[PDB]
Amino acid sequence: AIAQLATEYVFSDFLLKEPTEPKFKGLRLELAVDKMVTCIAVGLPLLLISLAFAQEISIGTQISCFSPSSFSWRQAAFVDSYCWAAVQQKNSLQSESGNLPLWLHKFFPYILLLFAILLYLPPLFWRFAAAPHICSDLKFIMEELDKVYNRAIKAAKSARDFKYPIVEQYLKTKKNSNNLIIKYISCRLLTLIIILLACIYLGYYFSLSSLSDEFVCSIKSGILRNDSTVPDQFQCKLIAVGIFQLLSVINLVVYVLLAPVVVYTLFVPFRQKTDVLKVYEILPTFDVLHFKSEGYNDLSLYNLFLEENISEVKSYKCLKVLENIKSSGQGIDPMLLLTNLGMI
Template identity: 60%
Template sequence: MAIASVATEYVFSDFLLKDAKEAKYKGVRLDLAVDKIVTFLAVGLPLFLISLAFAQEVSVGTQISCFPPTNFSWKQAAYVDSFCWAAVQQQADSSPFWLHKFFPYILLSLAILMCIPALIWRFTAAPHLSSDLSFIMEELDRFYNRAIKLAKNLASLDDKDANQDSQSSASELAEGCFKYLLVEQYLKTKRFTHILVVKYVVCRVLTLLILLLACLYLGYYILLASLIDEFPCDLRTGVLKNNSMVPPAIQCKMVAVGVFRLLSYINLGVYMLLSPLVVYAAFGPARQSSGFLRPYELLPGFGALGVIRPVYNDLSIYLMFLQENLSELKSFKCLQVLELLQLAGDEGFDTMCLLQTLGQVKTDVLDSRKMSTKNKEVKKPEE
C-alpha cells in the first residue's frame, strides 16, 4: 500500500506543471499561418523580381538601344540613348512607354502596398491581442494546475479513514475552486464585442483589394503595354532644333521589355493564386469553434463555454489565435496524454488513479451545481 501511495504521488507530481523561471509565452504568434503565407509571398515576390530586373540591367547594360545615324560618333550615340531614355514618357504615341521605364519601381510600390495591411494589424490589434492571449493561456495552465493539486489532495485521503464530513468538505472545496472560471467568463464577454474581428476583416479586405488592383495592372501591362517596345525619338530640341544634320526621328527599342513581360506573368500568376487564400482567411472567424479545447473537459468545472456558433465576434478571433498557439500551452499537451490514456483504457494503477480522481471531482462539481440550481428554482416560486 505504501508503494502504491508513493507511485501515485510521483504520477501527480509528473503531471503538475512547474513554475517557469523566465517569462512565459514570449513566442506568442499574432499572425495566422495563412496570413503569413500571403504576406510573405505578396511582399517577397515583387522584391525578388526587382532584384532580377536590376540584375538584368547590370548584365545587359543600358535599358534602351537607339539607332543613330552613321555619321554620329560614339559619344553622340551615347547621348542619343540617354536623351531618348529620359524622353520616354514624352512620346506622342498612346502606348505608355513610361511603364517600361518605371516597371521595377512599380513592383517596389506593390510590395510596399502589400505591407500596409500587416502593419495595420501589427500596430492596432496585435498589442492588445498579445496581452489577452498571454492572460488566457496563463489562466488555462493555472486552472489545470489547480485541478491536479486538488486531485492529488483528494487521492491522498484514505477512503477507509475518510468520514462523510471529510467527503462533503472535499466536495465543497472542489466546488469553491471551480465555481468561477476566470478564463471562461472572460471569453464569454468577447461574444458581444467586435473590435478585433472588424480590424481582422478590414485587413483581409484591404489585402484582397490591393491584390486585385495589382492583378489589373499586371494584366494591362502584359496585354497592352508590353506588346510595343519600339518608338521614334525626336532629337530636334534646343540648339539642335534647326540643325539639318540631325534627323527628325531616330528609332529606339526598349531592351528589357521581354524580361519585364516574363516577370509580370510570374507575379500575376502568384497573385491570382493568393486571392482565394485571402478570401479563405477572411471567412476564418465564421468557421472557428472551441472544439479544440475538448481535452480540457477532463478537468472538473470546464465546459461552460460550449461550442460557439459560426459568427463574427471577438471570441472567434481569440479562439483562432489560441488554436494557433496551442504549442505554447503545456497543460494542453498533458491533457492530450491523459485523454489518450483514457481512450486506450490503460490499466496502470497510477495513471488511472489520477483519471478516476479527476472524474470524481468533476462529478462532485456537476452534482453541486445541479443542487444549487434546483434550490434556486424552488426558492423563486416561494417568493
C-alpha cells in the same frame, strides 16, 4: 547574383522574423496562413524586381536608340539618355501603342515596389494596432489555463492523498465585442483589394503588344529643332521589357493563386474548428462549456489565435495527450491526470 536574391527572399527568414521584443515571447500574433500570404505577396514582387535586373539577365542599359554611324560616342549617349528621359514628354516620342505603355515600361520596378509596399501595409497595421491587444489577452488566457490546470491537478493530488471560471467568463465577454474581428477582416479585405488591383495591372501589362517597347524618339526640342546634322527621329527600344512581361505573368499567376487563399481567410468563423478548449472540459476546476463558435465577433478570432498559439501551452499538450488516449477509453481521465504529474 541570382542565388543571393534567392537566399534573401525565400531561403532567408524574410518577413518571418518574430517580434524582437520580450512582450510577445513565442506568441505568433499572425496566423500562419496570413504570415505566408504576406510573405508571398510582399517578397514575390521584390524577388521579381531583383531578378528583372540580375547582372546576367541584364545586357546593359535599359534603353538603346541606334544613333546614326556619323554620331560620336557621346552623341549616341545623349540620344539614349534623352529618349529615356523623353518617354515622359509625350511630344518628343511617337509610339504605336501609346505613351502609357512607355510609362509602364520605364517605371515597372517602381510599380512593383509600390504593390509590395501597399501589400505590406495591412500586415503592418495589424502588427501595430491590433497585435498587442490580442497578445496581452492571449498571454493572459494561456496563463489562466495553466493556472486552472495546476489547481485541478493539485485538487486531484490532494484527493489521492473561489472556483470561478474566470477565463470562461473572459471569453464569454470577447463573444460580445467585434472590434478586433473587424480590424482583422478589414486588413484582409484591403490585402485582397490590393492583390486584385495588382492582378489587374499585371494582366494589363502582360497584355501589352510586346512591341510597345520600341518607340520612335526625336531629339529636336530647343536649339536642336532646326538643326540638320541630327536625324529627324531615332528608333529606340526599351531592353528588359520582355523580362518585365515574363515576370509580370509570373506575379499575376502567383497572385491569382493567392487571392482565393485571402478570400478563404476572410471567412474567419468557418476556419474556427477543432475546438481547442474542448480538451479542457475534462478538468474539475474548469466548467463544462466550450461556448466558442458561430459569430462575426472577436471570439472567433481569439479561437483562431488560440488554436495557433496553444501548442506552446504545456497544460494543453498534456490534456490533449489524455484526450487522445481517451479515444481508446481504456482507463479514466482523472486517474491518468493524477499519473501525469506535470504542473509546469
